[PDB]
């Protein structure tokens, strides 16, 4: 409803930025998110008011904004915003480990990636697959060699990034980059500015069926 207008016409551009007075480990992780996406730019958040940030970004004509929140170095939340009064999803992060912690094996690939979405079934699954795949560079080639996997595992989006290469006897893998267990917890039709827009969906923590169902 805000993506058929500019689905594969314009390639997006993404600004990735941290919460407020961030940690060094958080800024490393934000750099890793910038390297995860194509055509994204990490922007230093310090003394940036969120309203003048968000409308300066929308007059600069960017498409998406990804802020990040932390707790004692460990990153805990991110927020996808779409700018022409588009929706914001906001997710939490659970098992986050990074290549700056694990291995200094050189640089990443930065190629236009492929995308895999495992069992996004429901209508909320289609809405979140739209909000996740419309932040990637539109129409990659055939022999593009990094893929991203977003597997729904009981509302826990496992996110990994791999560089594959086809043999003739199969295809072997090398994962690299981040590793997420993210989960959706809010989604609203306004931008990040308002906290006044209509809640399209947020999870109910405190009903008496809070653990039985999937994509609550």
């Amino acid at each position: 409803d805000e993506y058929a207008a500019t689905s594969g016409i314009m390639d997006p551009r993404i600004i990735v930025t941290t919460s407020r007075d961030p940690s060094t480990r958080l800024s490393q992780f934000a750099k890793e998110i910038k390297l995860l996406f194509p055509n994204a730019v990490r922007l230093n958040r310090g003394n940036y008011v969120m309203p003048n940030l968000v409308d300066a970004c929308k007059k600069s004509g960017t498409t998406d904004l990804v802020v990040l929140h932390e707790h004692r170095g460990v990153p805990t939340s991110l927020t996808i915003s779409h700018f022409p009064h588009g929706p914001t999803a906001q997710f939490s992060l659970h098992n986050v480990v990074m290549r700056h912690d694990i291995i200094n094996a050189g640089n990443q690939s930065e190629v236009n990636p492929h995308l895999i979405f495992d069992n996004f079934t429901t209508a909320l699954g289609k809405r979140v697959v739209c909000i996740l795949k419309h932040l990637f560079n539109a129409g990659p080639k055939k022999d593009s060699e990094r893929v991203i996997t977003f597997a729904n595992r009981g509302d826990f989006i496992s996110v990994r990034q791999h560089v594959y290469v086809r043999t003739r006897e199969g295809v072997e893998i090398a994962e690299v980059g981040p590793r997420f267990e993210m989960r959706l917890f809010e989604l609203r039709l306004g931008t990040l500015e308002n906290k006044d827009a209509d809640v399209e969906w947020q999870l109910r923590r405190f009903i008496r069926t809070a653990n039985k169902k999937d994509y609550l």
Partner: peptide, 22 residues
């Protein structure tokens, strides 16, 4: 590490962590 894994073809990082120097 694409060239290094291509060398591994023509000839798995995240299950081990590490630490700092001395």
């Amino acid at each position: 590490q694409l060239k290094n894994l291509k060398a591994a073809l023509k000839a798995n990082p995240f299950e081990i962590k590490a630490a700092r120097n001395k």
